[PDB]
Design a protein around this ligand. Structure first.
Ligand SMILES: Nc1ccccc1C(=O)O[C@H]1C[C@H](n2cnc3c(N)ncnc32)O[C@@H]1COP(=O)(O)OP(=O)(O)OP(=O)(O)O
Ligand SMILES: [Ca+2]
Ligand SMILES: [Ca+2]
Ligand SMILES: [Yb+3]
Lengths: 143, 485
């Protein structure tokens, strides 16, 4: 959107000791991950190895603002996910708890031992509160 | 205990043809899924029943609820229920003016005819009474009176067409005045002929039982994930199935934005009434309100048929929401509320509030990285350390699931004070924009409650006095370790 396109441009100027929005691929990942991504050293290659045949190895806004202008498609599910989270949060405390995750599961068909479940909360828990908040429930479903 | 209506008194207040609301009990039970309907022009009911074609989504003119044309959809929207208000009665016609041209052939307009029977139906509801006779150039007209001041109507004896004109003295909302002219109603094409349109059954929300959704997922794609060694790639694949098969909806050609179980659940409904006899075709033409994000309507009374065939009727939003909290969203059903509810809808600029749990907590959780940046985005609508954006990208480090809770709490609580620090000195430098200065006074607070929370979960500023801002490495970390014990 206008705002989206107004964001990729925002953070882009957070780290560029060049000034003219002319960054490097050495820091391109530092830009995509800080803004919500986790690409591999390979994904940086093939992509940048098509539009940037300049040989300079530098990047600007118009360039970057078009690359994400593709990936940012099937990923936009953000919504569905957020609505999904709210489905689990049966109590509406803002966090998904074992007891809750149990229901969502048993009622879906897959029964789980009070053990296996408490495992899913822990492998999904990133801050130890023993519960998953949207922020978390997001990573667990994105990265 | 919440003061809602039930059974008969509820159905009556709804608008749905009785036979139909009954036919719906079935499907509500058969699929254990709550059916929630939006109001329905009461003057439309008897029309629906007699078999009038309800209006699809390609027609947006409002139905009238007064005068002789009550129940139908007047072409001159000033005869609609929005009578009297301009920007509305105006944005109305334009809509009609479009349905007639951009759908040439599919939708048209025709003269209103009140047959001998309907007239009575109206004399009963006390909407219009057949008055004295009148002759105009060899034509017998019977006047039709209403308690309305601007317009005056009458009906012909030959073909039963109704006409209206402005009353000597008054002026249309749009500022007009005219003399005797046919009242035109929005019609639809059926077998080459034009048939009038009445209200349609607008669905507020559809919420089925979580199990009912399972049936949707193919017992093949399910197992594939149900049987995954690891646990993580499992939850993801699990949830993602709930998404893909129950939560997600896409735009359809004429049903607006809906999902698939909805398309079926929808279709079953229209069929269900065709069985009782409604010959006018469908009677539910578009997806549920919660998917209407451009022109959201906030109705006081909502009609609810529960999976037990019972009848309810929320007395008002606050309550409509209370009922959805205690019987649907907190009882293991599939439910999602419109995405524009606590935002300004773009279409009509509406601002419909709704209780969103994810936000309630917002205050007690520290911000991710995007939220930070994207907040520096929508923050620069009024109007250099990328460390705070990193420390924030560190806190939610997926590569955290190998450590133990005890561990997690530590590095995080630390990663918090680490981010809460690189923020303190940014403020200790230039008050940049008065409003940015606030955002941070805010984060600093969210950072607190979160950090503090992790500590009380296990063992604030107190500890912020003893620590190294000064050099930089793991050395700073080392001092920390001990402190927590
Ligand atoms: N276009 C303009 C003029 C006036 C008001 C709004 C708009 C109008 O375009 O916006 C419309 C679109 C929207 N809507 C309802 N279910 C939908 C579904 N899930 N998907 C998409 N949209 C849905 O609702 C608005 C009108 O809905 P409708 O169902 O055509 O008539 P309704 O509200 O029942 O009028 P009545 O029967 O009372 O005379
Ligand atoms: Ca919860
Ligand atoms: Ca957690
Ligand atoms: Yb409709």
């Amino acid at each position: 959107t206008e705002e989206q396109i107004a964001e990729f441009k925002e953070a882009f100027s957070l780290f560029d000791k060049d000034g003219d929005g002319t960054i490097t691929t050495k820091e391109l990942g530092t830009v995509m991950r800080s803004l919500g991504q986790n690409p591999t050293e390979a994904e940086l290659q093939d992509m940048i190895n098509e539009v940037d045949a300049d040989g300079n190895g530098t990047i600007d806004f118009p360039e970057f603002l078009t690359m994400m202008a593709r990936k940012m498609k099937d990923t936009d599910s953000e919504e569905e996910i957020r609505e999904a989270f709210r489905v689990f949060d049966k109590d509406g405390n803002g966090y998904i708890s074992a007891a809750e995750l149990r229901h969502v599961m048993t009622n879906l068909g897959e029964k789980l031992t009070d053990e296996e479940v408490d495992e899913m909360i822990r492998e999904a828990d990133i801050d130890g509160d023993g519960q998953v908040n949207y922020e978390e429930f997001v990573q667990m479903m994105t990265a | 205990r919440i003061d809602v209506l039930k059974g008969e008194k509820a159905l009556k207040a709804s608008g749905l043809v009785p036979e139909h609301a009954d036919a719906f009990k079935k499907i509500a039970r058969e699929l254990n899924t709550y059916i929630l309907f939006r109001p329905v022009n009461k003057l439309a009911t008897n029309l629906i029943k007699s078999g009038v074609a309800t209006k699809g989504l390609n027609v947006h003119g409002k139905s009238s609820d007064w005068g002789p044309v009550a129940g139908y959809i007047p072409f001159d929207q000033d005869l609609s229920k929005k009578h009297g208000q301009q920007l509305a009665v105006e944005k109305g016609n334009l809509e009609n003016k479009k349905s007639i041209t951009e759908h040439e052939g599919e939708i048209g307009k025709i003269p209103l005819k009140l047959d001998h029977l309907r007239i009575e139906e109206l004399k009963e509801n006390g909407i219009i009474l057949k008055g004295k006779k009148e002759i105009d150039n060899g034509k017998k007209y019977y006047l039709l009176e209403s308690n309305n001041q601007v317009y005056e109507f009458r009906i012909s004896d030959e073909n039963n067409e109704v006409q209206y004109k402005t009353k000597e003295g008054k002026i249309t909302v749009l500022g007009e005045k005219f003399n005797w002219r046919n009242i035109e109603v929005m019609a639809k094409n059926v077998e080459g002929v034009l048939k009038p349109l009445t209200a349609d059954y607008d669905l507020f929300a559809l919420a089925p039982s979580l199990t009912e959704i399972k049936k949707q997922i193919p017992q093949k794609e399910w197992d594939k994930v149900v049987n995954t060694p690891n646990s993580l790639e499992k939850q993801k694949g699990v949830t993602n199935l709930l998404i893909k098969y129950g939560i997600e909806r896409k735009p359809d050609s004429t049903k607006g934005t809906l999902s698939n179980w909805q398309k079926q659940m929808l279709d079953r409904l229209n069929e269900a009434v065709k069985y009782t006899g409604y010959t006018g075709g469908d009677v539910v033409n578009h997806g549920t309100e919660q998917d209407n994000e451009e022109f959201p309507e906030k109705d006081n009374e909502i009609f609810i048929i529960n999976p037990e065939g019972e009848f309810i009727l929320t007395k008002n939003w606050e309550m409509t929401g209370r009922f959805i909290e205690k019987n649907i969203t907190g009882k293991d059903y599939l439910y999602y509320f419109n995405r524009s509810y606590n935002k300004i809808a773009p279409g009509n600029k509406a601002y419909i509030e709704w209780t969103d749990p994810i936000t309630k907590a917002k205050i007690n959780t520290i911000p991710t990285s995007a939220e930070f940046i994207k907040n520096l985005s929508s923050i620069r609508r009024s109007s250099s350390v990328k460390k705070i954006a990193g420390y924030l990208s560190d806190y939610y480090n997926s590569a955290n699931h190998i450590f133990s809770q005890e561990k997690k709490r530590k590095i995080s609580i630390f990663r918090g004070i680490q981010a809460y620090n690189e923020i303190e000195n940014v403020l200790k430098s230039k008050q940049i924009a008065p409003e940015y200065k606030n955002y941070f006074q805010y984060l600093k607070e969210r950072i607190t409650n979160q950090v503090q929370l992790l500590l009380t979960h296990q063992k604030f500023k107190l500890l912020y006095k003893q620590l190294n801002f000064t050099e930089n490495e793991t050395d700073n970390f080392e001092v920390f370790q001990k402190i927590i014990d």
